[PDB]
Amino acid sequence: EIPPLVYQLLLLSAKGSKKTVLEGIISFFNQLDKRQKELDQLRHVEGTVILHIVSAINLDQDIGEELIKHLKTEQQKDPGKALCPFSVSLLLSTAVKHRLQEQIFDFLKTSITRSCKDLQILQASKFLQDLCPQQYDVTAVILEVVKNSAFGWDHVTQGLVDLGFSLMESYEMPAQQACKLGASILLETFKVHEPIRSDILEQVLNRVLTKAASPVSHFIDLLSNIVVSAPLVLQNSSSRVTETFDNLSFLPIDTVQGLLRAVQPLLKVSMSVRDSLILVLQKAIFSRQLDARKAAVAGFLLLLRNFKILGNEAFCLEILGSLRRCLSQQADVRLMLYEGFYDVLRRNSQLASSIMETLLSQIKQYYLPQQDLLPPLKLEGCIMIFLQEPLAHLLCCIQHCLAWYKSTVGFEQNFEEMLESVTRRMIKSELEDFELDKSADFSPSSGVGVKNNIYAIQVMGICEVLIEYNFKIGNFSKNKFEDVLGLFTCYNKLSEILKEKAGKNKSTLGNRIARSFLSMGFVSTLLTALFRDNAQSHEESLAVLRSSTEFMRYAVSVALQKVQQLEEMGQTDGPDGQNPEKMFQNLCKITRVLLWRYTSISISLLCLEGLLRIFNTMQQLYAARIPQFLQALDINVTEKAAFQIRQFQRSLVNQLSSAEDDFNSKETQLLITILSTLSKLLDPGSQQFLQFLTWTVKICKENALEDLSCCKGLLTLLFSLHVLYKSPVSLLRELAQDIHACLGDIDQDVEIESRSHFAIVNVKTAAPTVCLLVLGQADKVLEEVDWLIKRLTNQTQALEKGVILQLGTLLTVFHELVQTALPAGSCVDSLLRSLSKTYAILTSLIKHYIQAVPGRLEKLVKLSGSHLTPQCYSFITYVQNIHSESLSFAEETVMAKVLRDTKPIPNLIFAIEQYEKFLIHLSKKSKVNLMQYMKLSTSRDFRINASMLD
Amino acid sequence: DISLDVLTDLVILHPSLLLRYATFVKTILDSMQKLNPCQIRKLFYILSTLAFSQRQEGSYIQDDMHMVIRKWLSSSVPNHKQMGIIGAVTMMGSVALECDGQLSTLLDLVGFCCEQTPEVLALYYDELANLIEKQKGNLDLQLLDKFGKSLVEDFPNDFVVDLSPTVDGSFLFPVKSLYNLDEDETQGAIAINLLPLVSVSPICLSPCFRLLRLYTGEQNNGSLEEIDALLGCPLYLTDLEVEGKLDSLSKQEREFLCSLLFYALNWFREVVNAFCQQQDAEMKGKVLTRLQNITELQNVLGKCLAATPGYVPPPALQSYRPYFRELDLEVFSVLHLGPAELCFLLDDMCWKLEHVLTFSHLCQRSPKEVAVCVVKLLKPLCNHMENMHNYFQTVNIQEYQLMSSCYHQLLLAFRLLFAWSGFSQHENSNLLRSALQVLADRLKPGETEFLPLEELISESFQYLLNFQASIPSFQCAFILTQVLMAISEKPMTGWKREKMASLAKQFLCQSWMKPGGDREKGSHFNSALHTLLCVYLEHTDNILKAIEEISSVGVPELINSAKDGCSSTYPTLSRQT
DNA sequence: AAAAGAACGGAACGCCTGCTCTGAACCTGTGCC
């Protein structure tokens, strides 16, 4: 009924007109889908009609050319509208026609990029949402399209897969959003479009090995998702399991590990794949070079856990020695097996014995047993220039494997004796016993120096491992603690004075020390014993440990490096480091002692860093796991978060109210940053949001953060809350009064009262300390204004009223600064940079309205002429005096400085007249004389003083 | 256009390789309703003749094309319907390098579909004329006869008028044999009954004489045998002075007489086309008389064309230029003397020069052929040029303005000839040297004998500089100095730059006024003076010195002395200018 | 009269510097050492 009728209508349009009939039938389908949403026969009818229309368009491609222009015009008019499922389905269907699909794809990419940018802008500023509630999301409609076209359509699946293939490459922030959208639509169409599953898998496998140089992390992510959704898809896609290893050992950036983990079920259900990878293993491990041999050993280590350890065992008995055959390799290559052996050790018993025996042989290769003699560690073995046998990682692997072996239940007797002897040997030794006796022994860029430098790096790394092992052995054992405490005395003996070598760079690598070697569980437990570990069960070993003040400092400093490793990278060293759920529990336990120790009342300054980094991690890593932490912090998310702020506000006000003698500005800066980092996740409409604002403005307007970063840091905080809630132009106007009261006016003949509305700003804070930040907001305030003005290019009356209020109020602000004597730094430059920017935004709204008189606009112009222009030009005359006086400091080739010091001045004039020239254009076209309020554009001349040259 | 042009080479190299996808290609071409007429010709050229060429398996495309034209020759979509007959012309052209059956079937279908269509025999005959004009040379005599022998049935049956003086009927005006036959009583029957033909399509007759010229060009060397008694035909129209009563017309006969005249001058163009090149008994003389007749007829037309407020004449001053027989240069066999006739002839050639060197007939040849066409008879050009020079040495306003305009138009011709950017390409530098050889031999006693390029440059420079003495209008001075730039090198040498400075300063110091006073200050005058000043100041020796002298002597004298006139040292400079 | 035409009037993304914030052990001065 409907399909033949609309086919006849399309034939009529081919004979007649197509400008409006197309849009009419899109609208008909749109309301049909809307009424049917709250229909399989209707969906089949829709499939038939789209098939008919796409065949007709393919027959006459030029007929559909008007669709591109029509949709572009609609998108220019409608802010994100007209991108209905019908329209996008028609667009993708003709893309399969292969005619002009590139331009359609480019238009789609531009539209989605604009859509995600607009979504981010609206999310990051509610002030635009109130005046622009037309939040149109292309992602929502395109993801609903998957379900809409999941009823056996002619070419919807092909269009969607082509769209996703273009999307994934377009992704390469907006790029991350595009990649996420493409991956989601591919997953949805794989879970929906059954008959294209094999073709999709083959195509993505062809693409998966398509960017060797470029990152393909999104590719492996999507492949893993589709494989875990359909485990047997690649089984039906056979003859590719062998093929996928063509150039796998070229660029391991964790891509190889991800590929192996994604395909692991296939290997465990596909013996041919296992055999082929075994065959490739011989070539990979025997590669004489070391450029890419790391990927091979990493993949083999992962495979060891990939295959089950139930108990053919002959498979394992064969593959045990494969990696050991490459043990004599480069130190960097030898590194990864030590870190990775523990993971596979929890999957077998006999394999554990074999690995322990091999590691025993390796450690005995360097042990050098003796009694009451030189340090057993033959540090000179790895001296040569470079090193080929890391020791700290090996010892950490030794202790972890020993712990797991003991827990699961003579090499183990040899292990404990060797561990006990070397620990006893270390305490029964000193720097004199080691090769490094004197402080002036080794120097950087010296053959003896770098050798001793490597030795120093190794030995203190060894000390950390023995610290961890004895703690597990010494369950409330004072003798083991005495060995532990004495061992640390050797550790810092190398440090402090001869730390690393010396390191004159005033930098603190790894929080304070090089990369630690402590399992996260141990350091978590050590602090709990070290802090809050009060009980009669302890034998004063904690107390003497507490006596070692440097042990306190080192106790948390390692964890601070550890969390920073998890802060930047998504993983960390130590057992269970890359397991997030295991790490999350560790993250829950550690934070309590760090916070409590600070509240006990330097050392506490460390805990401030530790907390500030732990929040910044989980808010950026454990997005879904926040409720678990909040439950462990002890859906009232805002209640407890505000409670912690209250405990922190008391410390700050007490510190801020105290005299400058006891200031510790480093803590105060941290006290402010933690507020900002903890203010990110308050309730958007919470009362505590308003309550926190009411307190901070009181403190800012009352207290005087004379410290540089303290004033800057606190002012940064208040705006982050005062952006998503309101506009700050009232505050900026108020602050502009104080700086105007702080100094003298440009006119040099007018005085002002104290008018100290805010105590944060004072005479000593007249620097860019404040007048650069507020101008940054002035940059942001105008930055978002352009977005709506561009959109502005029924409620438009409200749109124009709001802009003229913010711009008009901001216009008064600039008038206040422009009469003051701004500091001669870059703040003079930046003021002229935004002043040039401000006039430009004044244009595009007027430039828009040309294509459309109100007196409200005139009153803004009247205020603009009266309070801005003559002052600005007079302010320009001020700059001449300032630069001339400032240029006297020329050590008592100034060509470079003079040009820069006056570079914004010409472009200030040009931005004045380009607005003026179009404002001239408006006046004639608008039939109104707007120039009576304003003033003739003044200009300046010069004169060379010939007499002064003598 | 480039895609079709390369497709020509692709089908030429491997016809089977192209016709492999030729099914889809032809389906797309037929389906695509949007196609430029030139693109229509390009596609149909092979789309209609692939079967005749590739006789093995090409019959499918030919059958599809014949079916679609049969459904569209009588179809209700005249827009692009003539594309079918265009493809027919392409088919005969391919056959004009058996197949007669397909052409006969197509012609029968066209005739059936155009039984009563007015613009059917018109456009069909236009297509045949284009055929033989462009690519009909290799056409067999039998094929050409079968295509276009309907002249013996159409022309003498109802379009060949009778020479008897008994013409009478319900005509708006009486029939008078304007421009009667030169040979009285030799062939009385030689006349054309125009008024009976209008009141048998008057629109259709104008593009016919071309076709009989084309027939006699293949059935004989010349047109004398077929049109011996018809070359000197008069026109059956009202009295020539009858146009004087334009007010007396009042559309009672004004429109009818306007159509009469409009068909008349186009018929004169047709006969001058068909019976010009051949030399026979008074053939070239009668051609000259026809030229004088058409000039006088157009002059008479001008009056009623101004009197007629609006018109929509059928194409088969300058505003009516599109609705005219755009006669090519093939008529110029007697180029080597009515000054008005010269003005009109070189006005006809000037527009073509401005278009091709900067509407199907002039576009049919490349500029390489334009060069040979223009150099075919450069000798009469220089002869008339020196005649006008001698007249100006001797020096009626009604004649003086005529010579002035002819002068200007001739210099326009040489400037748009030699300022051609195609001379930058050296693909025909020998042709340029040969073209300049006649001018070089005209300056010197002659016998260039492979003259040197620099010698030719200097000789042509001096020869064209000879005209720098006497010049009637400033626009002529502009075009003279610009053609003098055009022949010489782009960057002038020192001697030529000094000559440029001297001549341009002399022209600046010259005084220009129309024959009846009335200084020639106008609009084109402004651009002409702009170009003069640009080239002079560019080619001066001391540019700063020259501008200082101008702004320090010429302007002050104008501001001080001149009230409504020019400046004393620079009569070209004016307050308005 | 103040209308076109197209030659005149005009716009966007890309670039690494000459930039200023940041950096660093110092060397000075003076109550302490």
From Swiss-Prot, chain A:
NAD found in the keyword field: no
Which key words tag this protein in UniProt? Answer: Isopeptide bond, Phosphoprotein, Ubl conjugation
Q: In which domain of life is the source organism classified?
A: Eukaryota
Q: What are the GO BP annotations of this UniProt entry? A: DNA repair
Q: In the UniProt record, which is one GO cellular component term? A: nucleoplasm
Post-translational modification comment from the UniProt entry: Monoubiquitinated by FANCL during S phase and upon genotoxic stress. Deubiquitinated by USP1 as cells enter G2/M, or once DNA repair is completed. Monoubiquitination requires the FANCA-FANCB-FANCC-FANCE-FANCF-FANCG-FANCM complex. Ubiquitination is required for binding to chromatin, DNA repair, and normal cell cycle progression. Monoubiquitination is stimulated by DNA-binding.
Question: Subunit structure, per the record?
Answer: Homodimer. Part of a FANCI-FANCD2 heterodimeric complex that binds and scans dsDNA for DNA damage. Interacts with FANCL. Interacts with MTMR15/FAN1. Interacts with POLN. Interacts with UBL5; the interaction promotes FANCI homodimerization.
Cited function: Plays an essential role in the repair of DNA double-strand breaks by homologous recombination and in the repair of interstrand DNA cross-links (ICLs) by promoting FANCD2 monoubiquitination by FANCL and participating in recruitment to DNA repair sites. The FANCI-FANCD2 complex binds and scans double-stranded DNA (dsDNA) for DNA damage; this complex stalls at DNA junctions between double-stranded DNA and single-stranded DNA. Participates in S phase and G2 phase checkpoint activation upon DNA damage.
Question: What is the protein name stated in its UniProt record?
Answer: Fanconi anemia group I protein
Swiss-Prot record, chain B:
Location in the cell reads: Nucleus
Cross-link (Glycyl lysine isopeptide (Lys-Gly) (interchain with G-Cter in ubiquitin)) at which positions? K71
Main site of residence? nucleus
Q: Which GO terms describe its biological process?
A: DNA repair
On modification after translation, the UniProt record reads:
Monoubiquitinated on Lys-71 during S phase and upon genotoxic stress. Deubiquitinated by USP1 as cells enter G2/M, or once DNA repair is completed. Monoubiquitination prevents DNA release from the FANCI-FANCD2 complex. FANCD2 is only ubiquitinated in the FANCI-FANCD2 complex and the monoubiquitination of FANCD2 is promoted by phosphorylation of FANCI.
Keyword check for Metal-binding? no
Q: Name one GO cellular component term.
A: nucleoplasm
| Disulfide bond entries | none
Keywords carried by this UniProt record: Isopeptide bond, Nucleus, Ubl conjugation
Q: What does this protein do?
A: Required for maintenance of chromosomal stability. Promotes accurate and efficient pairing of homologs during meiosis. Involved in the repair of DNA double-strand breaks, both by homologous recombination and single-strand annealing. The FANCI-FANCD2 complex binds and scans double-stranded DNA (dsDNA) for DNA damage; this complex stalls at DNA junctions between double-stranded DNA and single-stranded DNA. May participate in S phase and G2 phase checkpoint activation upon DNA damage.
Which family, according to the similarity comment?
A: Belongs to the Fanconi anemia protein FANCD2 family.
Quaternary structure and partners:
Homodimer; cannot be ubiquitinated and does not bind DNA. Part of a FANCI-FANCD2 heterodimeric complex that binds and scans dsDNA for DNA damage. Interacts directly with FANCE and FANCI. Interacts with USP1 and MEN1. The ubiquitinated form specifically interacts with BRCA1 and BLM. Both the nonubiquitinated and the monoubiquitinated forms interact with BRCA2; this interaction is mediated by phosphorylated FANCG and the complex also includes XCCR3. The ubiquitinated form specifically interacts with MTMR15/FAN1 (via UBZ-type zinc finger), leading to recruit MTMR15/FAN1 to sites of DNA damage.
The protein's name is Fanconi anemia group D2 protein
**Residues of the whole record sequence present:** 493 to 1230 of 1439
